[PDB]
Design an enzyme around this catalytic site. Sequence first.
Site, PDB file in Angstrom:
ATOM      1  CD  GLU A   1      13.968  -7.577  68.963  1.00  0.00           C
ATOM      2  OE1 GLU A   1      12.830  -7.445  68.462  1.00  0.00           O
ATOM      3  OE2 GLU A   1      15.021  -7.434  68.309  1.00  0.00           O
TER       4      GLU A   1
ATOM      5  NE  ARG B   1      17.506  -8.728  62.316  1.00  0.00           N
ATOM      6  CZ  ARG B   1      16.557  -7.978  61.767  1.00  0.00           C
ATOM      7  NH1 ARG B   1      16.408  -6.715  62.142  1.00  0.00           N
ATOM      8  NH2 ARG B   1      15.756  -8.490  60.845  1.00  0.00           N
TER       9      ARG B   1
ATOM     10  CG  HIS C   1      11.894  -5.108  66.031  1.00  0.00           C
ATOM     11  ND1 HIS C   1      13.184  -4.912  65.586  1.00  0.00           N
ATOM     12  CD2 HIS C   1      11.292  -5.894  65.108  1.00  0.00           C
ATOM     13  CE1 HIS C   1      13.354  -5.556  64.444  1.00  0.00           C
ATOM     14  NE2 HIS C   1      12.222  -6.159  64.132  1.00  0.00           N
TER      15      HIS C   1
HETATM   16  N1  LIG Z   1      14.571  -1.949  63.434  1.00  0.00           N
HETATM   17  C1  LIG Z   1      13.771  -2.483  62.505  1.00  0.00           C
HETATM   18  O1  LIG Z   1      12.575  -2.766  62.736  1.00  0.00           O
HETATM   19  C2  LIG Z   1      14.316  -2.762  61.119  1.00  0.00           C
HETATM   20  C3  LIG Z   1      13.731  -1.944  59.978  1.00  0.00           C
HETATM   21  C4  LIG Z   1      14.334  -2.281  58.629  1.00  0.00           C
HETATM   22  C5  LIG Z   1      15.345  -3.283  58.520  1.00  0.00           C
HETATM   23  N2  LIG Z   1      15.851  -4.033  59.665  1.00  0.00           N
HETATM   24  C6  LIG Z   1      17.357  -4.111  59.749  1.00  0.00           C
HETATM   25  O2  LIG Z   1      17.961  -2.935  59.164  1.00  0.00           O
HETATM   26  C7  LIG Z   1      19.364  -3.247  58.754  1.00  0.00           C
HETATM   27  C8  LIG Z   1      19.671  -2.614  57.448  1.00  0.00           C
HETATM   28  O3  LIG Z   1      18.551  -2.771  56.521  1.00  0.00           O
HETATM   29  P1  LIG Z   1      18.721  -2.336  54.966  1.00  0.00           P
HETATM   30  O4  LIG Z   1      17.444  -2.591  54.281  1.00  0.00           O
HETATM   31  O5  LIG Z   1      19.375  -0.998  54.815  1.00  0.00           O
HETATM   32  O6  LIG Z   1      19.825  -3.459  54.451  1.00  0.00           O
HETATM   33  P2  LIG Z   1      20.862  -3.598  53.213  1.00  0.00           P
HETATM   34  O7  LIG Z   1      19.726  -2.974  52.479  1.00  0.00           O
HETATM   35  O8  LIG Z   1      21.073  -4.962  53.744  1.00  0.00           O
HETATM   36  O9  LIG Z   1      21.752  -2.553  54.039  1.00  0.00           O
HETATM   37  C9  LIG Z   1      22.773  -2.970  55.005  1.00  0.00           C
HETATM   38  C10 LIG Z   1      24.125  -2.543  54.480  1.00  0.00           C
HETATM   39  O10 LIG Z   1      25.091  -2.991  55.506  1.00  0.00           O
HETATM   40  C11 LIG Z   1      26.273  -3.380  54.842  1.00  0.00           C
HETATM   41  N3  LIG Z   1      26.951  -4.301  55.745  1.00  0.00           N
HETATM   42  C12 LIG Z   1      26.856  -5.676  55.964  1.00  0.00           C
HETATM   43  N4  LIG Z   1      27.677  -6.122  56.903  1.00  0.00           N
HETATM   44  C13 LIG Z   1      28.359  -5.063  57.364  1.00  0.00           C
HETATM   45  C14 LIG Z   1      29.407  -4.907  58.391  1.00  0.00           C
HETATM   46  N5  LIG Z   1      29.867  -5.918  59.098  1.00  0.00           N
HETATM   47  N6  LIG Z   1      29.861  -3.603  58.561  1.00  0.00           N
HETATM   48  C15 LIG Z   1      29.435  -2.526  57.875  1.00  0.00           C
HETATM   49  N7  LIG Z   1      28.445  -2.619  56.887  1.00  0.00           N
HETATM   50  C16 LIG Z   1      27.938  -3.908  56.658  1.00  0.00           C
HETATM   51  C17 LIG Z   1      25.847  -4.050  53.521  1.00  0.00           C
HETATM   52  O11 LIG Z   1      26.856  -4.174  52.572  1.00  0.00           O
HETATM   53  C18 LIG Z   1      24.611  -3.235  53.153  1.00  0.00           C
HETATM   54  O12 LIG Z   1      24.867  -2.231  52.125  1.00  0.00           O
HETATM   55  C19 LIG Z   1      19.441  -4.816  58.752  1.00  0.00           C
HETATM   56  O13 LIG Z   1      20.238  -5.286  59.855  1.00  0.00           O
HETATM   57  C20 LIG Z   1      17.979  -5.274  58.894  1.00  0.00           C
HETATM   58  O14 LIG Z   1      17.856  -6.550  59.462  1.00  0.00           O
HETATM   59  C21 LIG Z   1      15.263  -3.685  60.936  1.00  0.00           C
END
Ligand SMILES: NC(=O)c1ccc[n+]([C@@H]2O[C@H](COP(=O)([O-])OP(=O)(O)OC[C@H]3O[C@@H](n4cnc5c(N)ncnc54)[C@H](O)[C@@H]3O)[C@@H](O)[C@H]2O)c1
Lengths: 331, 331, 7, 7
Positions: A270, A241, A290
């Site tokens: 964005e 993000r 993205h």
């Molecule tokens: N770039 C993209 O197009 C894209 C692709 C997939 C997901 N998303 C983003 O990817 C990120 C992760 O996705 P994911 O599916 O693994 O999510 P989860 O499956 O939500 O994995 C995120 C992990 O981060 C941990 N977390 C939360 N707050 C935190 C903090 N302050 N410090 C350290 N760790 C923390 C959680 O406990 C969790 O295990 C999210 O921010 C999501 O919005 C974006």
Amino acid sequence: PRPLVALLDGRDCTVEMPILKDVATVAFCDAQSTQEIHEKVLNEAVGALMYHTITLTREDLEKFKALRIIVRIGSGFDNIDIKSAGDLGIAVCNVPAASVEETADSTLCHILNLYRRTTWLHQALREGTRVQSVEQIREVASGAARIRGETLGIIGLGRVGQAVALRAKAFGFNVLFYDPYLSDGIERALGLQRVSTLQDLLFHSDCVTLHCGLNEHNHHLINDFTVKQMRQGAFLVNTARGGLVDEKALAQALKEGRIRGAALDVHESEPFSFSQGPLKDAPNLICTPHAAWYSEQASIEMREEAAREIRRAITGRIPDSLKNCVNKDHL
Amino acid sequence: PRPLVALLDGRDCTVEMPILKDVATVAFCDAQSTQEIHEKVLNEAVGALMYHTITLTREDLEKFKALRIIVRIGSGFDNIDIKSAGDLGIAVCNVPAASVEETADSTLCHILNLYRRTTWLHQALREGTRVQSVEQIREVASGAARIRGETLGIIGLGRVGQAVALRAKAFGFNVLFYDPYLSDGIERALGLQRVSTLQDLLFHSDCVTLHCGLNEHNHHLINDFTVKQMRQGAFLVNTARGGLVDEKALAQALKEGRIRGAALDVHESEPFSFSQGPLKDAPNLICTPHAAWYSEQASIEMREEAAREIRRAITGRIPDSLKNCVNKDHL
Amino acid sequence: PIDLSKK
Amino acid sequence: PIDLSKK
Ligand SMILES: NC(=O)c1ccc[n+]([C@@H]2O[C@H](COP(=O)([O-])OP(=O)(O)OC[C@H]3O[C@@H](n4cnc5c(N)ncnc54)[C@H](O)[C@@H]3O)[C@@H](O)[C@H]2O)c1
Ligand SMILES: NC(=O)c1ccc[n+]([C@@H]2O[C@H](COP(=O)([O-])OP(=O)(O)OC[C@H]3O[C@@H](n4cnc5c(N)ncnc54)[C@H](O)[C@@H]3O)[C@@H](O)[C@H]2O)c1
């Protein structure tokens, strides 16, 4: 007779339709803005399908009269006030993991493009950069480092984060993560080093990559202060993000050289553009639209899932009939 | 008193020197051509240190009066007629594996840049390509595919080739290789599928990558004929030797679309340029300045090795005092 | 399939 | 360290 569901930020229901064709009246608004939404949609819309290119604050939600459920096509639900939403009586769901692989792969890709500089090498040739002797090779490629031994700092060991660690170890990386809200012991199961504070990680990392879900506590996680906690010439990779990194602090670091490089698929503002914003003139910078999540297979997959959630609702009962809800404890 | 050693294609002996400072008179010619070499060098040069930016045919070697050993700083000795050389009484050595990792990593990088299109996404933004809705994302990224399940065709399972397979499996790839001269059973030890003919591989591959040493039999391995043996929209990655691929056939395939993409670090005509050559106007094309091997650590490492070989000779006895010779059976 | 786009 | 480059 048949409730109404609208695809807020989009205008393609070819995938979802085959699943809501008999249980709803699917339509599209393609409202890039919360106000561009059609009147009747804000009036008679039992459900709503939305992506990320649009945020919803309490001020917005309270405008939906018949809205009872919002399905976010993706794993990110930070653009929605799931709380104020829940308290309003509207359930919010998400697609847990339909592009975890897509992102994990794309992430390691940005990491390799930095360490190996394969993206800049190409770009360089694309501009007439002539490389004859091995002498010049070490010049144009001046920066390419060895990965064997390097410590990969991972912030957030979630679905994506973990996938990255599996691939990371394959290249000889010395993976270590930080996830306060994560259960104890998981590091052992995966055979990974786990620090307890962000300060520790940034201190023991040569390459930091963000894989944590954005929220109220980690906003601007990377700022001028935490950057000082990072190492010299350390790499940064953000495919999570945009709010996670302070574009200004990073833009400054990149220029000063305190950061040898940076790869960003997500940005504070964005759509992104190398013309406007702090990174207007930032050295060693790779950016993607993205799209780390994109994949013809993953795209349809997540859309068919969200489509089912909308039906598990219109057909079943909220919320005990929803497989992936995010506010089942807020209402 | 002290034999002479010359760095043919180069002019930097800062690394080698500390090892030959007391056993030889190191000098540099920086001869990008076989004729640009200094006279006295072709006359009084017991040894010779060379890279790749220069080939040596029998016609050339027979010009070296005092030459007795040639050390190729790298694992590639295709630019040297090791045979005619050996028969002349001059031993030829090489650096077996000092950048295997560097290349393996860089290879997987090119593979990811194709499947994930992270290199073109950046380039696109770098030109003003504005991406707003998810709709546009699927457009600009139209091509990004899922790797889970895809079969990675590997031609040549050597030092580099094997490293690629370890990383390949990490991303979910279905690796399979082809190596006629390779011993039987190795596939079992590494848990990889092994085809017996190039035709079989190209038939069962979605992405073909070259990791075989160039020679007299595999020259132009990939030609209009073998391309017809490949699948539709198949990917190609060549980080080995330019002579392995027929730039003309590939340039044609890329245009026709029979090949969805291509990544090349090595080219038939080096230096490479997107302006001249068959790939003058080839779609979906990524190219690097033959630097997949580069790494400040790997560079010095291989140079210090070659430096030792030169000393194991000037101090020891040819060839039983050489750890990495390639013509010990030709003279 | 309904065009609910604000004109 | 010797410049044996053809002038
Ligand atoms: N770039 C993209 O197009 C894209 C692709 C997939 C997901 N998303 C983003 O990817 C990120 C992760 O996705 P994911 O599916 O693994 O999510 P989860 O499956 O939500 O994995 C995120 C992990 O981060 C941990 N977390 C939360 N707050 C935190 C903090 N302050 N410090 C350290 N760790 C923390 C959680 O406990 C969790 O295990 C999210 O921010 C999501 O919005 C974006
Ligand atoms: N792009 C670069 O900068 C770079 C980096 C490292 C090495 N080199 C090139 O990388 C390639 C492989 O290096 P490596 O260290 O793994 O070499 P090895 O260690 O020589 O590996 C090559 C393998 O290819 C097999 N092989 C030979 N001829 C073949 C044929 N016709 N078909 C199928 N397999 C065949 C061999 O049996 C061997 O196991 C070589 O061509 C070398 O010149 C270039």
